[PDB]
Design a protein around this ligand. Structure first.
Ligand code: 5RP
Ligand code: 5RP
Ligand code: MG
Ligand code: MG
Lengths: 215, 213
């Protein structure tokens, strides 16, 4: 099943985000309230986006580090479908977010933007976490860290463990072939869509490439 | 003396103000807790600094990536300090620190959940001078207590050159566990906000710190 496309709204205000969504809401599968937007506007961003686009999956990229129940409930009460929990969070923080998520028929992803270990990954699975976001840090990318062999190995291993894997971190259209033959769940594009000359055509290019590579 | 910080882990500004209107003058540091950062966004920082410009305002954003961008948003909103979560990429902590210096502020590494002594050395080499030794709320709720392993780890961090903040469901009675250590800040959230008398709770903390240090 083709990788889906997620747009990251890493905008500081709602109006900046809407300049993107008004173009591409019907060209992507998942609308993400990026961490930058969650911090810029708060959880109203999730509520307002879901109200605009109630037929789409809305993801609140809160990167919950602690207070799993309280922070997940705030996002779900704002009508989020999915929320993120950062990989270094205490295991009880993940479980607590998942418990709330289940009350709302939502889901939790673990955000792999840190150091983390294979034992922790097993803990996530036993806890009933079914999604991870394999994430090349924005700041690592800026310090010259490219997608490499080790990333492919790890993604495959996470998939083999039974996670649906999302891939993200400065993805460009030309990076998609690196991942061919792996059952990627979702590719996230932020800058490569929002900042394109034509965000609509950028999203359509990602979709065509995906349909070729995984078709 | 160790400073006293109140954590505003509220979902709305008006809820936070129920606490600050009682105790803003009784503490040294007013923290915009992560919960308030998510509830209201960075306006919480701007509003609270405008109200209490003579106090240190900490934005507990627990930055995980996009260090330069998220730190700048907090500092543009007049934060004094910001937190970066311990599993962030080292370039995230450096990014946030570089921005902090532009604004004459500072970064704290939030030690919630998993981290390593190797990473602690990395932070130090990066120029990070503050950490928050944090017993996770969810760990506390699963029965994790403070213990001697926590004291040993705090001393170790202190010896490495970090100014250490101590937090995680701290009660007045917990203060003597840390005697002898040059603790930079003690945070109280629930034990001040939710006390029968928040003013007495804050003054009792300050009194005990003055006794012990
Ligand atoms: O969580 C994030 C960091 C971004 O939202 C995501 O990784 C994708 O955005 P970009 O393609 O601009 O890196
Ligand atoms: O980041 C936090 C967790 C709180 O802001 C901090 O720990 C103080 O709160 P409390 O004393 O209620 O645990
Ligand atoms: Mg994101
Ligand atoms: Mg806090």
């Amino acid at each position: 099943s083709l990788p889906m496309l997620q747009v990251a709204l890493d905008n500081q205000t709602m109006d900046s985000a809407y300049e993107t969504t008004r173009l591409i809401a019907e060209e992507v599968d998942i609308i993400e309230v990026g961490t930058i937007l969650c911090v810029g506007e708060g959880v109203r961003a999730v509520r307002d986006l879901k109200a605009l686009y109630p037929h789409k999956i809305v993801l609140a990229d809160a990167k919950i580090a602690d207070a799993g129940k309280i922070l997940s409930r705030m996002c779900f009460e704002a009508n989020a479908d999915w929320v993120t929990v950062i990989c270094c969070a205490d295991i009880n923080t993940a479980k607590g977010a998942l418990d709330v998520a289940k009350e709302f028929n939502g889901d939790v992803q673990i955000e792999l933007t840190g150091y983390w270990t294979w034992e922790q990954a097993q803990q996530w699975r036993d806890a009933g976490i079914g999604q991870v976001v394999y994430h090349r840090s924005r700041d690592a990318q800026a310090a010259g860290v490219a997608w490499g062999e080790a990333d492919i190995t790890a993604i495959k291993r996470l998939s083999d463990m039974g996670f649906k894997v999302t891939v993200t971190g400065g993805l460009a259209l030309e990076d998609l072939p690196l991942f061919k033959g792996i059952p990627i769940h979702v590719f996230i594009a932020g800058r490569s869509i929002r900042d394109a000359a034509s965000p609509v055509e950028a999203a359509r290019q990602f979709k065509r490439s995906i349909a070729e590579l995984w078709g």
